[PDB]
PDB file of C-alpha atoms and ligand atoms in Angstrom:
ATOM      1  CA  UNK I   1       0.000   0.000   0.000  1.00 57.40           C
ATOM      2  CA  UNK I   2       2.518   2.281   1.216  1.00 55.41           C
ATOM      3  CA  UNK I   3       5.068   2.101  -1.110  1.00 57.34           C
ATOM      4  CA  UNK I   4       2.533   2.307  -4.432  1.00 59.41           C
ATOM      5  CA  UNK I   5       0.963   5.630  -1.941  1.00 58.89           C
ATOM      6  CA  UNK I   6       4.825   6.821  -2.292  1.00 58.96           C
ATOM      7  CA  UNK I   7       5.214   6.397  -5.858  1.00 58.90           C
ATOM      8  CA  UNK I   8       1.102   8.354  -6.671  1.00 58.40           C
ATOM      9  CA  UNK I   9       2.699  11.156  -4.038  1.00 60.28           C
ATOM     10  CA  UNK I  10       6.094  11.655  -6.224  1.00 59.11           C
ATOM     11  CA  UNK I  11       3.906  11.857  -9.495  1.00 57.67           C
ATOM     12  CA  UNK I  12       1.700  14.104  -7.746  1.00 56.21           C
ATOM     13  CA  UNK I  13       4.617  16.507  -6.367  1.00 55.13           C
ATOM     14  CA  UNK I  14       5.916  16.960 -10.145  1.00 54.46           C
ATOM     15  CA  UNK I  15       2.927  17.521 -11.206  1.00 55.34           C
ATOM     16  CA  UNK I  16       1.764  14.320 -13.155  1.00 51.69           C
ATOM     17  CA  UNK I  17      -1.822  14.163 -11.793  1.00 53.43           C
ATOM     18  CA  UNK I  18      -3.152  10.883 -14.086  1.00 51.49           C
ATOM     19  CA  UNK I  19       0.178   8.878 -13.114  1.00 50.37           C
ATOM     20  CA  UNK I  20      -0.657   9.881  -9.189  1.00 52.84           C
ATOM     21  CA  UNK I  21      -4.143   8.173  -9.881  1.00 52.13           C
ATOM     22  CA  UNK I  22      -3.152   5.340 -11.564  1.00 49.80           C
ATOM     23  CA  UNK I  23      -0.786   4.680  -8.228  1.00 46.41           C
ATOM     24  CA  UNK I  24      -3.165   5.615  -5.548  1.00 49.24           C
ATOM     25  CA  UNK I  25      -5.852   3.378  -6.931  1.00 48.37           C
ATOM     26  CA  UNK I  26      -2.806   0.188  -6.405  1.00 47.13           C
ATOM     27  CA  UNK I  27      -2.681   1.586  -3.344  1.00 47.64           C
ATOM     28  CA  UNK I  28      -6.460   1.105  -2.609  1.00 48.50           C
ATOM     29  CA  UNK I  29      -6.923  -1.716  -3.486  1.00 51.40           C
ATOM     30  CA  UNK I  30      -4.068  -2.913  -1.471  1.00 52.30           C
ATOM     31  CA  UNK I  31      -5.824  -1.260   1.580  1.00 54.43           C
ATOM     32  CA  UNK I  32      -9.877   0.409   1.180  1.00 57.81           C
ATOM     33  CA  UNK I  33      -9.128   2.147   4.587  1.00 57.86           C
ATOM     34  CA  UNK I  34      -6.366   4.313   3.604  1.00 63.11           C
ATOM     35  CA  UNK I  35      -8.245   7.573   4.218  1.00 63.82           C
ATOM     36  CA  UNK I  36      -4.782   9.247   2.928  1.00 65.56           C
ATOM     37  CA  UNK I  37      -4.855   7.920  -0.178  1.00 67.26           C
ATOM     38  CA  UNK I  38      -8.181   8.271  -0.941  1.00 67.49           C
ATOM     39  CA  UNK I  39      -8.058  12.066  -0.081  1.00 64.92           C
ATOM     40  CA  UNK I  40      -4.992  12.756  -2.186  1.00 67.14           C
ATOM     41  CA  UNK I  41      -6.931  10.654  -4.840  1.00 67.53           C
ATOM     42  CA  UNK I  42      -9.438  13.696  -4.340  1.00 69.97           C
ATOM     43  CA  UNK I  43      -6.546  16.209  -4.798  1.00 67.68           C
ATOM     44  CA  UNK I  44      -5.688  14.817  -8.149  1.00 64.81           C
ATOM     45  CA  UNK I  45      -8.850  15.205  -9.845  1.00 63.92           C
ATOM     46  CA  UNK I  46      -9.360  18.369  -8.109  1.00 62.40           C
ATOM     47  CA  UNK I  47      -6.191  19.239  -9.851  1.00 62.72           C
ATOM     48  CA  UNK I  48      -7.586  18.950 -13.072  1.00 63.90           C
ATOM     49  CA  UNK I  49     -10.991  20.536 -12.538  1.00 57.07           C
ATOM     50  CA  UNK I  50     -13.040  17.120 -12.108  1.00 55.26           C
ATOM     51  CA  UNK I  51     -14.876  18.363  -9.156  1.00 57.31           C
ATOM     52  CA  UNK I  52     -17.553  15.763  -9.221  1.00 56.87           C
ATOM     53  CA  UNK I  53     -14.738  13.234  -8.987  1.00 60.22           C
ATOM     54  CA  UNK I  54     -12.882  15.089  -5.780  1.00 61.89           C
ATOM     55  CA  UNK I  55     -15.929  15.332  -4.092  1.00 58.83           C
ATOM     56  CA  UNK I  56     -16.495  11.477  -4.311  1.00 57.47           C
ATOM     57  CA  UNK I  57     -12.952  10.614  -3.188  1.00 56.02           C
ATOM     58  CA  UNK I  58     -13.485  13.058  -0.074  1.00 53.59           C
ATOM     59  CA  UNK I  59     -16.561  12.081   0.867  1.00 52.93           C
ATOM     60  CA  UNK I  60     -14.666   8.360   1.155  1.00 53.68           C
ATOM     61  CA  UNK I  61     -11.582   9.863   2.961  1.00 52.45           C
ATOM     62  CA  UNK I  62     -14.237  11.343   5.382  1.00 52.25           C
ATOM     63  CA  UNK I  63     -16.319   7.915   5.954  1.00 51.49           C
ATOM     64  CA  UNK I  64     -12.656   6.940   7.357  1.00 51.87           C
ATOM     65  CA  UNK I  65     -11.791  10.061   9.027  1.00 52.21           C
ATOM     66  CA  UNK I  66     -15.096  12.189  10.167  1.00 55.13           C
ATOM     67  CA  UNK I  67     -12.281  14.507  12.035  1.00 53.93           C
ATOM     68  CA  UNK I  68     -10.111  14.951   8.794  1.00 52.88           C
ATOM     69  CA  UNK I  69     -10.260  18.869   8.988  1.00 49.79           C
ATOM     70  CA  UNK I  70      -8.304  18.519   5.681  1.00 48.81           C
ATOM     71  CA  UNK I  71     -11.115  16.587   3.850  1.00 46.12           C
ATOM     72  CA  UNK I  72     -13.575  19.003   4.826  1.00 43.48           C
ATOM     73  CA  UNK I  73     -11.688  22.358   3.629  1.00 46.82           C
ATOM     74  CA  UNK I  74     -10.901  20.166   0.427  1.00 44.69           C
ATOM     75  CA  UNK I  75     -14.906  19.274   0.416  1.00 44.96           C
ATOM     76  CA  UNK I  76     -15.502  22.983   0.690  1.00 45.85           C
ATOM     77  CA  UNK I  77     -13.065  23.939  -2.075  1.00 44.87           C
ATOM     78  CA  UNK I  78     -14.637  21.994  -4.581  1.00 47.87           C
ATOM     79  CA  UNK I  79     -18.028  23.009  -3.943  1.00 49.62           C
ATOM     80  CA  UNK I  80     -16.457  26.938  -3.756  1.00 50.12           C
ATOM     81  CA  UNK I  81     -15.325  25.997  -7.441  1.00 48.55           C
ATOM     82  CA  UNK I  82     -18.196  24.895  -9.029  1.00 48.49           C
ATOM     83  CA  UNK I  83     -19.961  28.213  -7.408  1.00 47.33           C
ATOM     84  CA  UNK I  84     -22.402  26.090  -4.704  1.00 44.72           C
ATOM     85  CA  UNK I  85     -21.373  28.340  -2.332  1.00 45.74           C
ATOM     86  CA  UNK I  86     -23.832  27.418   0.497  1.00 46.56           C
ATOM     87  CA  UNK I  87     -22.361  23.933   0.711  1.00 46.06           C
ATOM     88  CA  UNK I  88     -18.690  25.456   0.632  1.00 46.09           C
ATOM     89  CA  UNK I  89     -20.176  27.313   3.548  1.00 44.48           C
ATOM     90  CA  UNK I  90     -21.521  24.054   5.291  1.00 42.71           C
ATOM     91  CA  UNK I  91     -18.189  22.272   5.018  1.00 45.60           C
ATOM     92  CA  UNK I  92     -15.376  25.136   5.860  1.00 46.27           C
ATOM     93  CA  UNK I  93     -17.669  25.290   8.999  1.00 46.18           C
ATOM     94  CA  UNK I  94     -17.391  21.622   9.514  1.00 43.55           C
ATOM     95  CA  UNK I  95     -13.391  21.813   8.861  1.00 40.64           C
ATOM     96  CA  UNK I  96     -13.706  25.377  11.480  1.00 39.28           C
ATOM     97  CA  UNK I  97     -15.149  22.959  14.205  1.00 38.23           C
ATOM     98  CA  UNK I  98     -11.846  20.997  13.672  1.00 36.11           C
ATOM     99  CA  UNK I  99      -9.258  23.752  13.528  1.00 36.29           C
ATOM    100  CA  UNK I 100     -10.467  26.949  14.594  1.00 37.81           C
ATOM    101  CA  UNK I 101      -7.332  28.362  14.703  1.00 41.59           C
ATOM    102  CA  UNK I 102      -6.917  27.584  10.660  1.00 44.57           C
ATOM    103  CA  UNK I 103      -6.562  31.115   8.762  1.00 45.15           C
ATOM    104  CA  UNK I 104      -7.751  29.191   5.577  1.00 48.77           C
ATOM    105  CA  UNK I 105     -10.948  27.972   6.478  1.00 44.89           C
ATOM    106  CA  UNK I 106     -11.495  30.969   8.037  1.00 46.32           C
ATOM    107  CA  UNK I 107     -10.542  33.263   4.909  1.00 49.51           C
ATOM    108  CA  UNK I 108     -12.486  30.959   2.685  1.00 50.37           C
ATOM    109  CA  UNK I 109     -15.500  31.364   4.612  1.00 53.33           C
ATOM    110  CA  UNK I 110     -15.301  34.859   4.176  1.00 55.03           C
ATOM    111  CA  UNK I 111     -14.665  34.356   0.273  1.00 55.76           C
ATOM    112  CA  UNK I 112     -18.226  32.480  -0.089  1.00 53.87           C
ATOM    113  CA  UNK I 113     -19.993  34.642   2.319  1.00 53.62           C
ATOM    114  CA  UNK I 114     -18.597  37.561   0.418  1.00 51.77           C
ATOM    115  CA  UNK I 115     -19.602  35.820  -2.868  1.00 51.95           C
ATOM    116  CA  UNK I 116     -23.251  35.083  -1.247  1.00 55.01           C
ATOM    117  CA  UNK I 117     -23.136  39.009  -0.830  1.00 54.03           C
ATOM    118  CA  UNK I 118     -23.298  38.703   3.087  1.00 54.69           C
ATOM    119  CA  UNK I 119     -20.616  41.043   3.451  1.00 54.95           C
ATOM    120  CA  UNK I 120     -20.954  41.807   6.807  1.00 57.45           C
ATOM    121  CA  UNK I 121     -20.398  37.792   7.615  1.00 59.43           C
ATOM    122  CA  UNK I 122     -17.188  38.145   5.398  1.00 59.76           C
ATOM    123  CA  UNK I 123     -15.879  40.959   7.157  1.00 62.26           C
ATOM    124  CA  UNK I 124     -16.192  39.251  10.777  1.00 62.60           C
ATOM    125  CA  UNK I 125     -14.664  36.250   9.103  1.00 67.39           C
ATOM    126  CA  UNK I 126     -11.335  37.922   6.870  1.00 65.14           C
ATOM    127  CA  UNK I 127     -11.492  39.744  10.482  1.00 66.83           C
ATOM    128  CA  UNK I 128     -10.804  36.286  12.581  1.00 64.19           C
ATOM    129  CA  UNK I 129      -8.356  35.360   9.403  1.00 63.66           C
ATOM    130  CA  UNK I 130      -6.361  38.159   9.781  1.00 62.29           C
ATOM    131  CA  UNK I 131      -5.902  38.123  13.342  1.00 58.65           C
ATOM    132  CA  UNK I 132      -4.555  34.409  13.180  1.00 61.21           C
ATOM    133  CA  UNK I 133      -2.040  35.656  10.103  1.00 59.39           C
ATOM    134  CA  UNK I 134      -2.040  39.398   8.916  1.00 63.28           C
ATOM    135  CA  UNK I 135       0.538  38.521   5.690  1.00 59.18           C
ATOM    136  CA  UNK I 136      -1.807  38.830   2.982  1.00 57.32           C
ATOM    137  CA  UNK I 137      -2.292  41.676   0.944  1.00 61.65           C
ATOM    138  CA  UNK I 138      -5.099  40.136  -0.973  1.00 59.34           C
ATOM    139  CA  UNK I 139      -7.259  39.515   2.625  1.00 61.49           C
ATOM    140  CA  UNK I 140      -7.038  42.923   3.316  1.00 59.24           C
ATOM    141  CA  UNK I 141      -7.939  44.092   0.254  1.00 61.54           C
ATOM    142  CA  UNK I 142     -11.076  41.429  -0.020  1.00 60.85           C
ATOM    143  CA  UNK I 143     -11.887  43.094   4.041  1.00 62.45           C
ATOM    144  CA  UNK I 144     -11.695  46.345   2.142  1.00 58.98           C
ATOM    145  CA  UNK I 145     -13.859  45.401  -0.627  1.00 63.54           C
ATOM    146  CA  UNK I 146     -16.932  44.151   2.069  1.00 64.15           C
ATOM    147  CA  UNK I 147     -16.751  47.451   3.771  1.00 61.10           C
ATOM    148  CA  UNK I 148     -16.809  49.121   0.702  1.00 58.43           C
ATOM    149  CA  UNK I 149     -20.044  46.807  -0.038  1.00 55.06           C
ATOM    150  CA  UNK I 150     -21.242  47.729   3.153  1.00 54.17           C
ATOM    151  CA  UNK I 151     -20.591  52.159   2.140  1.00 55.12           C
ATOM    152  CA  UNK I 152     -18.046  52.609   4.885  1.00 55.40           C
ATOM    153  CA  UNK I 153     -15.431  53.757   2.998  1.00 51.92           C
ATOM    154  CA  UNK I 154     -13.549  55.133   5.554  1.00 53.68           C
ATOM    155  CA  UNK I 155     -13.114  51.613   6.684  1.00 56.75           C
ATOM    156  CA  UNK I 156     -12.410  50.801   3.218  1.00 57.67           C
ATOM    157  CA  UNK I 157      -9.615  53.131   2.838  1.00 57.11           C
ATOM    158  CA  UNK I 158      -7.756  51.763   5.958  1.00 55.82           C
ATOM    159  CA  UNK I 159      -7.477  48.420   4.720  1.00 53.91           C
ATOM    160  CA  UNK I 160      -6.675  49.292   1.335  1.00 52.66           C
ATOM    161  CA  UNK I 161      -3.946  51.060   2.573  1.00 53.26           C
ATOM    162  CA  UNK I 162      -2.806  48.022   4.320  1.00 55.79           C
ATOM    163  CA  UNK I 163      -2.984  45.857   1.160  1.00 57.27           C
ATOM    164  CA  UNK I 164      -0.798  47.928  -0.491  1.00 57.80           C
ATOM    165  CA  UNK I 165       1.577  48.344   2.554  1.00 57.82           C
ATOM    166  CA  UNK I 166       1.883  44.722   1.888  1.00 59.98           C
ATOM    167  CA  UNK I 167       1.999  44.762  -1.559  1.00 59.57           C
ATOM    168  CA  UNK I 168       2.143  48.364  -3.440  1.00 60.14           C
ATOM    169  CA  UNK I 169       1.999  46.374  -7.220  1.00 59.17           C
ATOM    170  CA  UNK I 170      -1.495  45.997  -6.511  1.00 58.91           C
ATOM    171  CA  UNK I 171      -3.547  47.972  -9.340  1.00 58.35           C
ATOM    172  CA  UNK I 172      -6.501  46.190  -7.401  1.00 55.06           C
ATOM    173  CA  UNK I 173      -6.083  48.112  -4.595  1.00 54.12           C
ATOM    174  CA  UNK I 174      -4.621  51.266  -5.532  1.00 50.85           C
ATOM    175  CA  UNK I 175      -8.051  51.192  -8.177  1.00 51.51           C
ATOM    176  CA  UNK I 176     -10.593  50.859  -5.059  1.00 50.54           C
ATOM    177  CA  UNK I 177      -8.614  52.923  -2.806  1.00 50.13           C
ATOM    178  CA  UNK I 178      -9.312  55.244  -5.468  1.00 50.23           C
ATOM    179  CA  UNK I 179     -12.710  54.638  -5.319  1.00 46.18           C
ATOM    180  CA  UNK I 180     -13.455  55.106  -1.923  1.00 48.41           C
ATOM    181  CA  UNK I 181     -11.706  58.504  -1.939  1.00 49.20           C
ATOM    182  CA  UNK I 182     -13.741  58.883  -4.893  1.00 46.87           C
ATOM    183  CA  UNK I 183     -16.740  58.348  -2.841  1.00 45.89           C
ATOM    184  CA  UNK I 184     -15.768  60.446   0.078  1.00 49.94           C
ATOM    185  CA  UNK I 185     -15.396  63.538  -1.979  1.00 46.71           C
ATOM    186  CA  UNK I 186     -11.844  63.894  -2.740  1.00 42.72           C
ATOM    187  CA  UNK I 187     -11.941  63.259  -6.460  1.00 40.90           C
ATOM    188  CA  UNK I 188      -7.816  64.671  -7.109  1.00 40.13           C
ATOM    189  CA  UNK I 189      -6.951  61.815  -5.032  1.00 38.66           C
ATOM    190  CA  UNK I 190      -9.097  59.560  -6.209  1.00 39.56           C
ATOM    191  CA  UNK I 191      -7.393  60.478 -10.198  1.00 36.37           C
ATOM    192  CA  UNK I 192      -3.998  60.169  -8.736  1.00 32.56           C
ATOM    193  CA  UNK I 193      -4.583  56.257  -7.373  1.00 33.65           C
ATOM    194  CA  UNK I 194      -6.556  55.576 -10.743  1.00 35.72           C
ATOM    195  CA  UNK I 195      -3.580  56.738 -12.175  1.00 34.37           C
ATOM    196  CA  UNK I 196      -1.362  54.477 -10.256  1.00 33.77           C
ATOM    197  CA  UNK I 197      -3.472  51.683 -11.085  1.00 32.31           C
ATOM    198  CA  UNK I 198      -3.066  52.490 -14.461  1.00 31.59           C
ATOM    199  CA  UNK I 199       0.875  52.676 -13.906  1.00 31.07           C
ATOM    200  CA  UNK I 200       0.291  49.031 -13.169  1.00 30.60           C
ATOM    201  CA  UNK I 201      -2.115  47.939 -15.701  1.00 31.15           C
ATOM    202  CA  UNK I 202      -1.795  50.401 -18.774  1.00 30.94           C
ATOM    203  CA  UNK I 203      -3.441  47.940 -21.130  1.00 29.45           C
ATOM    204  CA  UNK I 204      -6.927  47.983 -18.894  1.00 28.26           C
ATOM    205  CA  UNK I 205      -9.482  49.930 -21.536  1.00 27.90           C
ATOM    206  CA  UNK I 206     -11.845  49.826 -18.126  1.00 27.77           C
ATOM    207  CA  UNK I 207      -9.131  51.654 -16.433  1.00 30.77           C
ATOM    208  CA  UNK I 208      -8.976  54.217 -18.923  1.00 30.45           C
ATOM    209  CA  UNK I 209     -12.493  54.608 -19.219  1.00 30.28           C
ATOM    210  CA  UNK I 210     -12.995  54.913 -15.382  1.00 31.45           C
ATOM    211  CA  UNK I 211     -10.290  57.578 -15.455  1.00 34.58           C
ATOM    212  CA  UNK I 212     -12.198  59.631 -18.062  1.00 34.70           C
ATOM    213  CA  UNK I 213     -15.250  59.226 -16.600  1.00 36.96           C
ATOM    214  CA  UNK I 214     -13.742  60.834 -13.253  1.00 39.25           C
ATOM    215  CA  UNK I 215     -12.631  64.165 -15.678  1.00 40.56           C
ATOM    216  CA  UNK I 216     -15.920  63.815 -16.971  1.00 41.44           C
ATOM    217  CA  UNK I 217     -17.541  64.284 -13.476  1.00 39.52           C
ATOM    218  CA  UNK I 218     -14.590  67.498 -12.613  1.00 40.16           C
ATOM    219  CA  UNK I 219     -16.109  69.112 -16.045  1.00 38.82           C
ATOM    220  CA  UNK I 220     -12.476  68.434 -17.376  1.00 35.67           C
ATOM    221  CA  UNK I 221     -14.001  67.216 -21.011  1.00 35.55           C
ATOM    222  CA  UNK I 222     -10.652  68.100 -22.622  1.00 35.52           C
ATOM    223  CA  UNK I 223      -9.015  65.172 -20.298  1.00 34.04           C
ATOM    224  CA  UNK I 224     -11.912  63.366 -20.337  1.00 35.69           C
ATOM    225  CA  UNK I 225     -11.882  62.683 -24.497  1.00 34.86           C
ATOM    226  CA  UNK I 226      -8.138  61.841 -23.841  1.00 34.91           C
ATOM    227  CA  UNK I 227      -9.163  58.966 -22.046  1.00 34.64           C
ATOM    228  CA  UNK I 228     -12.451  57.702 -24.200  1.00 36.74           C
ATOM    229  CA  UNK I 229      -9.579  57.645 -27.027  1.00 40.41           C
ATOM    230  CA  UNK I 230      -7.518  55.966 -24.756  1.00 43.35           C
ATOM    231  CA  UNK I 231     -10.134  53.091 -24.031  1.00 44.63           C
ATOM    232  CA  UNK I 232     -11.407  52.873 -27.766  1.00 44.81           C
ATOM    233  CA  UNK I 233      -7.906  52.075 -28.493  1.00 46.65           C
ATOM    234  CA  UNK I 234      -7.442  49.184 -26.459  1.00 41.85           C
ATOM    235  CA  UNK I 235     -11.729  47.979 -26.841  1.00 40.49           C
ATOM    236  CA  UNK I 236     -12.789  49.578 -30.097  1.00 39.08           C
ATOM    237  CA  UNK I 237     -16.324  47.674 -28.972  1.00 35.94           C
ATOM    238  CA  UNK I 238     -17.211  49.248 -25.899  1.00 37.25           C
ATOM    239  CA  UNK I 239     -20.284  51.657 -25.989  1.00 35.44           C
ATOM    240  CA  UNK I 240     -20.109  52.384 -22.573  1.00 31.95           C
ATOM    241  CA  UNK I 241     -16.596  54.649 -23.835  1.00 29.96           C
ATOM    242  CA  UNK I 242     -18.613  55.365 -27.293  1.00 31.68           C
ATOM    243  CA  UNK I 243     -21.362  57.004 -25.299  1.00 33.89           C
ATOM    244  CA  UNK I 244     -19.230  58.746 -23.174  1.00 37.48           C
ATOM    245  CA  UNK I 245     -17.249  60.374 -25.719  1.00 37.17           C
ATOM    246  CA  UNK I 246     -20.393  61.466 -26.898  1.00 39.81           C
ATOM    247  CA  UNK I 247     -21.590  63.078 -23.816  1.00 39.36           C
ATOM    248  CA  UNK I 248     -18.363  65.021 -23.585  1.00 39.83           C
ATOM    249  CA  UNK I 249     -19.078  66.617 -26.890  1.00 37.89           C
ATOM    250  CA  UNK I 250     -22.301  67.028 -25.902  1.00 38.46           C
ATOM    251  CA  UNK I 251     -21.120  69.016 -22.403  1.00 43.10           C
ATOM    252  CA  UNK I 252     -18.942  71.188 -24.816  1.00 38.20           C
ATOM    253  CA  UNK I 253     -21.607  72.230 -26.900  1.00 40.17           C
ATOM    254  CA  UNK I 254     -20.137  70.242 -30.067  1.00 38.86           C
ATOM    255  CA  UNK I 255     -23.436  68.648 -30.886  1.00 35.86           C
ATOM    256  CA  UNK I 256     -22.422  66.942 -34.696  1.00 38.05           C
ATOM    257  CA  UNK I 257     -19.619  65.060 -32.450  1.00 38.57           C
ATOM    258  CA  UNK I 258     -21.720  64.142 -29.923  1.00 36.24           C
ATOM    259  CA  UNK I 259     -24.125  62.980 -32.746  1.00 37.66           C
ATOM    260  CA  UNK I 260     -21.343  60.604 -34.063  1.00 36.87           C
ATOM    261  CA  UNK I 261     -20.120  59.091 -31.310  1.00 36.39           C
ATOM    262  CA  UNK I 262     -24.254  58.769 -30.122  1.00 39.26           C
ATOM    263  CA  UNK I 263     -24.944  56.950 -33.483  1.00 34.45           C
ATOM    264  CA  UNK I 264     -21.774  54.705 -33.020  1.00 34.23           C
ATOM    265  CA  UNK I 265     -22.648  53.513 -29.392  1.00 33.83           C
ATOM    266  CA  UNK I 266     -25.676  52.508 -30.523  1.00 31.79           C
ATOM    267  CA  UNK I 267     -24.733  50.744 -33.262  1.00 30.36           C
ATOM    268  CA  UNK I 268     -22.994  48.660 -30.793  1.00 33.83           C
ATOM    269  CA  UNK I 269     -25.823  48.616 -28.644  1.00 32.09           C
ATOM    270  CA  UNK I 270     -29.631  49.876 -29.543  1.00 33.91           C
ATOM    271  CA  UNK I 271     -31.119  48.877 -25.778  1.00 33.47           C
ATOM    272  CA  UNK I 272     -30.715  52.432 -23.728  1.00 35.99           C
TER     273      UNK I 272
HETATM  274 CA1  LIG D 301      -7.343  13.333 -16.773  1.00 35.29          CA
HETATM  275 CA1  LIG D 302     -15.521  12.267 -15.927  1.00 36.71          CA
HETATM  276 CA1  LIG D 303     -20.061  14.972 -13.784  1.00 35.21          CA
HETATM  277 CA1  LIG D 304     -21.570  17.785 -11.664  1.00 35.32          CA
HETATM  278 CA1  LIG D 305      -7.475  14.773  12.699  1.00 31.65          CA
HETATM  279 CA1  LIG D 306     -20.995  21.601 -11.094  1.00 34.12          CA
HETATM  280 CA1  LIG D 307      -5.826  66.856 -24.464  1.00 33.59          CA
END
């Protein structure tokens, strides 16, 4: 048993998730009750994206091991991937009984409470994640993003700011910090973090967009073109930056452009 378990685990570890299979079903058959190999058979289809298949080989590590903390995360993660996030609630909770001092399960449970739109369940969760181990960025910005779901930006800000402490690459971050300046009123530095973000990502035609749209909103129509152009360059197909362009004519009392750009949005797009 051991031995073949050895062999699935070193095909596994390079990366060779059909040969790991292959081994680890010798090795079952040599002994049903290895819950360890059955799990790890789980981690090699989840590997590949057969879901369906994980979840079997879990649910069979956890008939041997009910206490397997490991099985239930893994149970959990599979269910998170196929977007049933209810059950990947049910079993991070089950793997939480287990180890309530894992930051994972805890993280994760914010993840699908946060994708369930419970945000004020993900915050006290990334909250209890963070206070067992504060080392990543992308937990503080996800806490940032519920308490921007939940309008306290202020909040928001805060843990944006610690995100990008941890990790100032982040065009994520620096993009929402941006926002919730945006929201609190302070729209110059809102345009100097877009403009970070778009130091990061340059190719982002949202980016762009979002960064003429916040000219647009000063009255700075000159800047605010700039940008459209900028975002038709990189997604000659979006509207949205069609219409826009449009509107900026329109504010500058330069009606036959405004006509053009109108008729070319909606060309794209007859709905609104
Ligand atoms: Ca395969
Ligand atoms: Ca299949
Ligand atoms: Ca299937
Ligand atoms: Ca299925
Ligand atoms: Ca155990
Ligand atoms: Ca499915
Ligand atoms: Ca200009």
């Amino acid at each position: 048993a051991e031995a073949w378990y050895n062999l699935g685990n070193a095909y596994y570890k390079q990366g060779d998730y059909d040969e790991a299979i292959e081994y680890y079903q010798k090795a079952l058959e040599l002994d049903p009750r290895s819950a360890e190999a059955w799990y790890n058979l789980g981690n090699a289809y989840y590997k590949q994206g057969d879901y369906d298949e994980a979840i079997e080989y879990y649910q069979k590590a956890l008939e041997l091991d009910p206490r397997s903390a490991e099985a239930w995360y893994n149970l959990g993660n599979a269910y998170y991937k196929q977007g049933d996030y209810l059950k990947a609630i049910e079993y991070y909770q089950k793997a939480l009984e287990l180890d309530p001092r894992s930051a994972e399960a805890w993280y994760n449970l914010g993840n699908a409470y946060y994708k369930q739109g419970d945000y004020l369940k993900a915050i006290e969760y990334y909250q209890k994640a963070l206070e067992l181990d504060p080392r990543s960025a992308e937990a503080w910005y996800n806490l940032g993003n519920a308490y921007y779901k939940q309008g306290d930006y202020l909040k928001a800000i805060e843990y944006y700011q610690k995100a990008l402490e941890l990790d100032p690459r982040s065009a994520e971050a620096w993009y929402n910090l941006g926002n919730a300046y945006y929201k609190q009123g302070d729209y110059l530095k809102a345009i100097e973090y877009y403009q970070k973000a778009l130091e990061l990502d340059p190719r982002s035609a949202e980016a762009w967009y979002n960064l003429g749209n916040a000219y647009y909103k000063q009255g700075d129509y000159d800047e605010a073109i700039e940008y459209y152009q900028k975002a038709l360059e990189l997604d000659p197909r979006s509207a949205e930056a069609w219409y826009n362009l449009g509107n900026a004519y329109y504010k500058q009392g330069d009606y036959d452009e405004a006509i053009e750009y109108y008729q070319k949005a909606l060309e794209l797009d007859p709905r609104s």
